[PDB]
């Protein structure tokens, strides 16, 4: 990742490049049958957003649906709680406590009493938390709150340098505004972590987007990076100094 290069935290790759033979298909139903809330019997276009199951890492994999107006209606004036654990791999470390020798999250399950699980989560400059929960199909498109939807995202992953034209939120603005301004349009939407090796962290999120009317086109390649820290892609949190 340059910081010369894309500012931004985002470079556009090319097309959508998408195969929409092997997308969720739409279909007709209510609010009620889709969203298991209320007793809105308002009918409803929608896709069942395909999530991956995590890895044997722990680690969580692409995510892809079709975006529908009606999906982004209902997720804006309705929120869900955050399913039990949800922070995605490398969100905090593991160690032995006999060793002090780094473990992993499947040791950690497997006995607690030996193993300690500690945040890499840390506060950094007006002053926040430095990586996020970071969605992969946003919540405001209709994404579901748990682990298997996240990557531990930088804060600028997630949003940039929230103008609204930065990290992930760059391109989900898009989308959501396009369907917002065309509401019979639907979006092919993909986003794809890339992880190397078995880092815990993805280095970027590629995602890809296919409108029905051919507005919108690309993918772009969203880096999980920051200005001015070295992120632990293997472990997650920062390179020790
Ligand atoms: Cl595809
Ligand atoms: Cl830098
Ligand atoms: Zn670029
Ligand atoms: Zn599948
Ligand atoms: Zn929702
Ligand atoms: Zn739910
Ligand atoms: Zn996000
Ligand atoms: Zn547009
Ligand atoms: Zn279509
Ligand atoms: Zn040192």
Known sequence: WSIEQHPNYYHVEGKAQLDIKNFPELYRTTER??????????????????????????????????????????????????????????????????????????????????????????????????????????????????????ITGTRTQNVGNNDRKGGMQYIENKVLDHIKRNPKVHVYYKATPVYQGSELLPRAVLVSALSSDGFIDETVRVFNNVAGFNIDYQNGGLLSS
Request: proline share 4%; aromatic share 12%; no cysteine.
């Open 33 to 150: 049958v889709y969203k298991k809330s209320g007793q809105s019997t308002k009918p409803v276009t929608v896709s069942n957003i395909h999530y991956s199951v995590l890895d044997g890492y722990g680690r969580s994999g692409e995510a892809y649906g079709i975006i529908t107006k009606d999906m982004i209606d209902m997720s804006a004036g309705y929120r869900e709680k955050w399913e039990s654990k949800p922070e995605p791999s490398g969100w905090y470390s593991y160690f032995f406590k006999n060793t002090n020798q780094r473990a992993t999250e499947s040791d950690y399950k497997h006995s607690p009493k030996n193993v300690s699980k500690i945040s890499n989560n840390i506060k950094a400059s007006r002053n926040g938390y430095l990586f996020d929960r970071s969605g992969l199909i946003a919540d405001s498109l209709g994404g579901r709150p748990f682990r298997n939807n996240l």
